Design a protein around this ligand. Structure first.
Ligand SMILES: [Cl-]
Ligand SMILES: [Cl-]
Length: 162
């Protein structure tokens, strides 16, 4: 198991514009297109991202390319963030994957808002961190996914994905 297989399980794959759990236009493997309500604004963002007139449909290769870019960007975002970097540096490999998953889903800013949890992770207080992470809109809105990630931070294993 690795970050790519883990995100692939959590995000699925869709080759046609779809709405995400928050109602926003997305495509591929969790690639957010826009927060705007406009499907036109989304097809415009899609063509811009792929570099062709897509008509709201992409191939598997294109989906995977957006995916590779998005993971790389998430990792680079963590490394450049003063709040996130030290947490990431402190973690083992499995748990680093869980932080990446969170950043991919909610963005750098979103995660950076889990101040108290981040402190507990840094301190390696796993059970406590798991409890605190659950007191969040994130957990209430996407409970199954959040439990998998939380279990990952709790145990330092891939059991939730097995
Ligand atoms: Cl892009
Ligand atoms: Cl869920």
């Amino acid at each position: 198991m690795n970050i790519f297989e883990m995100l692939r399980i959590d995000e699925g794959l869709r080759l046609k514009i779809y709405k995400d759990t928050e109602g926003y236009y997305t495509i591929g493997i969790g690639h957010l297109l826009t927060k705007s309500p406009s499907l036109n604004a989304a097809k415009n963002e899609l063509d811009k991202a792929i570099g062709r007139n897509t008509n709201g449909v992409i191939t598997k290769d294109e989906a995977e390319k957006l995916f590779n870019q998005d993971v790389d960007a998430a990792v680079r975002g963590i490394l450049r963030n003063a709040k996130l970097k030290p947490v990431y540096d402190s973690l083992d490999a499995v748990r680093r994957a869980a932080l990446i998953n969170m950043v991919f889903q909610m963005g750098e800013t979103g995660v950076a808002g889990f101040t108290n949890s981040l402190r507990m992770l840094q301190q390696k207080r796993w059970d406590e961190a798991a409890v605190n992470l659950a007191k969040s809109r994130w957990y209430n809105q996407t409970p199954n996914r959040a439990k998998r990630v939380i279990t990952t931070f709790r145990t330092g294993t891939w059991d939730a994905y097995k």
